[PDB]
């Protein structure tokens, strides 16, 4: 059948791709630069697909082949093709190339291919052994470049334990590996390990532990924008649970801004959900466009109903949407925040009143916010003013709420501070861009 | 004799703390920023049609930054010193 | 209709007059330059696709 022949063709182009990747790994090893490693792991997700049993069998029978225990470990875990007519001997290593032991980069990359393919076959137990052997091999290695590769497999390791639904037999190991990376002053490995540990903490709901670590540990700035986005999302969740709502909103906005354009639909959906919830907690109505995006329409539709209910001020609609779709929030891990918003809706009305009016009396505020008594209105407006949501003061002598008069900000030092932040960022960008300049010898 | 020949073009101490005419500084900023606008148009056209605006833009930026930074710092020093 | 510059204060009954500050040409040209290098950044986004 010609279909099998075309499958063989795409398989051998994948073989060429992985040959190029291992060549780049060796060039990084012999070129004293880790950026080639980063490029190899950047091409890694693209070739994580398009592979089958024979692709990996020919890979492991083309590389390694030094009669080491590696062959005895990875060959039995995957099937083998029959005596095919096209017995094209794929041997990237010839003689002395096959004689020397494989570099940690190439062996780690091929073992990574084994574990991701095994995961794609959805038999997690088989991949568990290969991952454990991989990280037994790479634990002793202190290669700086390998850490990059190590970083990636680190993530994959946690990933497989997600399908094993344990996430706890390895928590101590991730802690120790993160500590090792910290003493190695590594950037990528430390960042990815922090992200994985935070994900584990939130999966097991240990928010206090995550808050303690993020207070103690420092996320490396010089990390991947993807890892930065994951860390920002986790930190935003932490601050939202810790009631630090404004900082959580800012952090989640930064995470959304650093999202991979249109690559991670699920991560963007979760970030949008949490950001909408926390923004509602602040009393700010979110952007409407979020609900009309092609990928986030149905996902945020219950949140559209929630936002409509709170903006309209109909607490009955709030309870109704809690009854029908609120259970979904439990699957989304936001139910507690939604209850907090159920009991914090009135903040949005107070903010609206402050935005529109400037000297509205307490009785008018109570009338427009469905508050039973003017004294309750006084309490609510005073609390909102104290909690940094309103910029007014209540003249209790005659009961009117005078907002702080708007002063010409350009005549103040605020524009200077904003321009200072912008100038510092621009100068830092110029320094970073000129600092590398990558002039080869 | 080297130092006392240097005394010829040496600026006085009052020149360091003096401030350029503010009404003139604004006009200079307006002019150079408008030239930078024309230069940015030329730079966009050149970069887009690639697959000397850059040098001129860099020189204008150097001029603007040095002028404004020096004027601002002189202003701060004068505000603190004379009270 | 952008005739004689001033604003009526109906609250007490007044028509104030002022001198209509010019526009600060520097800021308008700065906005134009910001737009221009936004275009330049889009052009660089068209580049950098060659790794």
């Amino acid at each position: 059948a010609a279909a099998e022949h075309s499958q063989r063709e795409l398989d051998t182009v994948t073989l060429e791709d992985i040959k190029e990747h291992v060549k780049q790994l060796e060039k990084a090893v012999s070129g004293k630069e880790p950026r080639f490693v980063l490029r190899a792991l950047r091409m890694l997700p693209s070739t994580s697909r398009r592979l089958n049993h024979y692709v990996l069998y020919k890979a492991v029978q083309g590389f390694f082949t030094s009669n080491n225990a590696t062959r005895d470990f990875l060959l039995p875990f995957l099937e083998e093709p029959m005596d095919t007519e096209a017995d094209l001997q794929f041997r990237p290593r010839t003689g002395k190339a096959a004689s020397t032991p494989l570099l940690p980069e190439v062996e780690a990359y091929l073992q990574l291919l084994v574990v991701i393919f095994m995961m794609n076959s959805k038999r997690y137990k088989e991949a568990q052994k290969i991952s454990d052997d991989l990280m037994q091999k790479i634990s002793t290695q202190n290669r700086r470049a390998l850490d990059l590769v190590a970083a990636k497999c680190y993530y994959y390791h946690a990933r497989v334990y997600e399908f094993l639904d344990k996430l706890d037999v390895v928590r101590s190991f991730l802690h120790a590996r993160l500590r090792t990376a910290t003493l190695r002053h590594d950037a990528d490995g430390q960042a990815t390990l922090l992200n994985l540990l935070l994900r584990n903490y939130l999966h097991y709901s240990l928010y206090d532990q995550a808050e303690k670590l993020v207070s103690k540990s420092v996320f490396p700035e010089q990390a991947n924008n993807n890892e930065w986005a994951r860390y920002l999302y986790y930190t935003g969740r932490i601050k939202a649970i810790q009631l630090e709502y404004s900082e959580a909103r800012r952090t989640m906005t930064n995470a959304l801004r650093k999202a991979p354009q249109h690559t991670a639909v699920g991560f963007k959906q979760t970030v949008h959900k949490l950001l909408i919830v926390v923004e509602l907690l602040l009393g700010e109505i979110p952007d409407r466009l979020q609900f009309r995006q092609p990928s986030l329409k149905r996902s945020l539709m219950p949140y559209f109903l929630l936002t409509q209910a709170v903006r309209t001020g109909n607490l009955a609609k709030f309870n109704q949407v809690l009854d029908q779709f609120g259970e979904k929030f439990q699957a989304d891990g936001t139910y507690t925040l939604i209850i907090r918003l159920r009991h914090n809706v009135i903040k949005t009305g107070v903010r609206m009143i402050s935005l529109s009016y400037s000297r509205i009396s307490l009785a008018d505020i109570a009338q427009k916010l469905q508050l039973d008594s003017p004294e309750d209105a006084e309490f609510i407006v005073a609390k909102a003013i104290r909690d940094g949501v309103i910029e007014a003061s209540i003249n209790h002598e005659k009961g009117y709420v005078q907002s702080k008069e708007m002063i010409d900000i350009y005549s103040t030092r605020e524009p200077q501070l904003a321009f200072h932040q912008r100038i510092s960022f621009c100068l830092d960008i110029h320094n970073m861009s000129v600092k590398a300049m990558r002039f080869p010898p | 004799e080297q130092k006392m020949l240097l005394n010829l073009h040496k600026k006085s101490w009052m020149e360091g703390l003096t401030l350029q005419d503010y009404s003139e500084h604004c006009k200079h900023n307006e002019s150079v920023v408008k030239e930078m606008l024309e230069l940015a148009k030329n730079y966009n056209k050149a970069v887009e049609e690639e697959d000397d605006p850059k040098r001129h833009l860099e020189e204008h930026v150097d001029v603007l930054m040095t002028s404004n930074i020096v004027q601002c710092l002189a202003a701060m020093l004068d505000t603190v010193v004379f009270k | 209709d952008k005739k004689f510059h001033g604003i009526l204060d109906q609250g007490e009954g007044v028509l104030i007059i002022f001198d209509e500050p010019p526009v600060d040409k520097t800021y308008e040209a700065a906005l134009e330059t910001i737009q221009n290098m936004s275009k330049v950044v889009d052009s660089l986004y068209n580049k950098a696709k060659k790794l």
Binding site: P440 | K54, H60 | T33, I34, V41
Partner: peptide, 30 residues
Amino acid sequence: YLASLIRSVVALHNLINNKIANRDAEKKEG
């Protein structure tokens, strides 16, 4: 701030051009 932004964009363009040039040389070597 405008001048600093201009300089940063120019530096970014220069870095992109330099990376393109060194990759072009590396691929043309083979």
